[PDB]
Design a protein around this ligand. Structure first.
Ligand SMILES: NC(=O)C1=CN([C@@H]2O[C@H](COP(=O)(O)OP(=O)(O)OC[C@H]3O[C@@H](n4cnc5c(N)ncnc54)[C@H](OP(=O)(O)O)[C@@H]3O)[C@@H](O)[C@H]2O)C=CC1
Length: 476
């Protein structure tokens, strides 16, 4: 099936044990000084040894840090690598309420490193930022957002990017030597998870072809909330849900009933026999979401959430992105999803579906903030499953016909890299296959791998695509 052919999933596969020798040159470890006390942080510092130079990254001050870094590099000469432990700062930034401090500080570290001319590869360390290997629990969706940013740093600054490595719960000497061995030589891998049983690396693979009924998707009924539901993809989603038996669709967006084409969408849906509520509700406004849930009919309880609210504009290259630009991109993603998760964790939903992006799955140059914000969605769906709650994340490629890519500016970039426009019917038919399987995570994308692989790997290899035979063929 053509719909099967759109579905991919991320997998984690065992890679080689690294060597036993620590790096020969000096490491620079970067610490968030208010968030330096987590057991994993202390275990990593202890692993890097006391000849490691330590840099405390205080506040969020690019220029100040560029000066401090330039001095360290003057005094020490080249470093072997930069090891960032800033991900431990999960608290939200005081001035940008949708940005985790660690995320803002990682962006400023990547910028300031470039500003000072430190060229040693940067490695971003997380703990519980990914779900790698069977039974693995993703404990920190916040740190998971950092992997969306790091993949984009690897595309924009390939020559000074090491990679990402997730630490285990307890960093024992076996975990420590795996870490220090990877910092000595990682075999070309750059998205790694250290676990009890071995070191795992991230891979993209074609998904299992569809099986009718396997995940036992309950029939669509009751009230379903589609945030961004007046939007391109969200309106098509609502039409499908209508066709599928929803009693009541609650569509939200900032503009609500004043959104473009909202009257037409309400009319098409109602012709189908559905109750329609359209509300103007910022998805990051907790009190407004609560008010909306409190209003639902007794006879039509919430049964599902489809989170399509989001913006992609006003992003920027890693070297330029501001914290205010990052905040505005994170708002509908991190803040809204966190509220949706908190207000439905007790409702026994049949589906909690979060719409992510290929920028968060593989990465796309020029879109670091969107990549981080979408990577948090993917992370939260895995975390929710760990709590015994339903969730899925669907990272879309490019939609044709409706939505954000229907601009010869935004359309023509993606398609030229081999990320082709999907027919909405095909994209939705694939999503239903994912829902019928009850899968946690998928990318649904039409790819031209002959165009995509070579373009994506022009400046550094990708181990992520080694598990796509089309990509392996294109690079042969
Ligand atoms: N189109 C595509 O190819 C792809 C889309 N995606 C993702 O799919 C989802 C749908 O995108 P698409 O339909 O194409 O985009 P659209 O711009 O058509 O729809 C996005 C919308 O979400 C709403 N929205 C934006 N911010 C908020 C907010 N803070 N609170 C509530 N609603 C908000 C918008 O309305 P308003 O401005 O009135 O709030 C609009 O309804 C997005 O999350 C997007 O990131 C991912 C990959 C590809």
């Amino acid at each position: 099936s053509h719909m099967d052919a759109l579905r991919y999933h991320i997998e984690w596969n065992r890679v080689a044990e690294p060597g036993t020798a620590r790096p020969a040159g000096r490491l620079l470890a970067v610490i968030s000084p208010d968030h330096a006390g987590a057991p994993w942080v202390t275990a990593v510092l202890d692993a890097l040894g006391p000849d490691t130079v330590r840099f405390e990254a205080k506040g969020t001050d690019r220029a100040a840090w560029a000066a401090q870094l330039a001095q360290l590099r003057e005094d020490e000469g080249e470093f072997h690598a930069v090891v960032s432990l800033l991900a431990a700062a999960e608290a939200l930034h005081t001035d940008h309420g949708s940005v985790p401090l660690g995320l803002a500080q990682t962006l400023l570290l990547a910028q300031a490193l470039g500003d000072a001319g430190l060229t040693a590869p940067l490695w971003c360390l997380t703990r519980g930022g990914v779900a790698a290997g069977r039974g693995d629990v993703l404990s920190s969706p916040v740190q998971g957002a950092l992997w969306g940013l790091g993949r984009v740093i690897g595309l924009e600054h390939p020559d000074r990017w090491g990679g990402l490595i997730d630490l285990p719960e307890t960093v024992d000497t076996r975990a420590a030597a795996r870490l220090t061995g990877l910092l000595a030589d990682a075999g070309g891998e750059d998205q790694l998870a250290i676990r009890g049983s071995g070191v795992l690396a991230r891979r993209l693979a074609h998904a299992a072809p569809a099986v009718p009924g396997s995940g036992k998707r309950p029939p669509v009924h009751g009230s379903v909330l589609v945030t961004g539901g007046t939007g391109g993809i969200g309106g098509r989603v609502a039409r499908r849900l209508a066709e599928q038996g929803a009693a009541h669709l609650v569509l939200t967006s900032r503009r609500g009933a004043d959104a473009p084409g909202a009257a037409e969408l309400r009319a098409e849906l109602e012709q189908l026999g559905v109750r329609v509520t359209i509300a103007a509700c910022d998805a990051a406004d907790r009190e407004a979401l609560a008010a909306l849930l409190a209003e639902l009919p007794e006879d039509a309880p919430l049964t599902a959430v489809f989170h399509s609210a989001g913006v992609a504009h006003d992003d920027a290259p890693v070297a330029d992105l501001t914290l205010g630009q990052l905040d505005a991109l994170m708002r509908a993603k991190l803040t809204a999803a966190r509220h949706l998760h908190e207000l439905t964790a007790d409702l026994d939903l049949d589906a909690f579906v979060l719409f992510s992006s290929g920028a968060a799955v593989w990465g796309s140059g020029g879109h670091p903030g969107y990549a981080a914000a979408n990577a948090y969605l993917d992370a939260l769906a895995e975390h929710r499953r760990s709590l015994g709650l339903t969730a899925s994340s669907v990272a879309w490629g490019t939609w044709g016909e409706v939505g954000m890519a229907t601009d010869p500016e935004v359309h023509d970039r993606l398609v030229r890299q081999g990320v082709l426009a999907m027919e909405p019917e095909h994209a939705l038919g694939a999503l239903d296959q994912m829902l019928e399987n009850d899968d946690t995570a998928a990318a649904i994308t039409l790819m031209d791998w002959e165009m995509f692989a070579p373009a994506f790997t022009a400046n550094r290899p990708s181990a992520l695509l080694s598990t796509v035979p089309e990509a392996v063929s294109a690079l042969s």
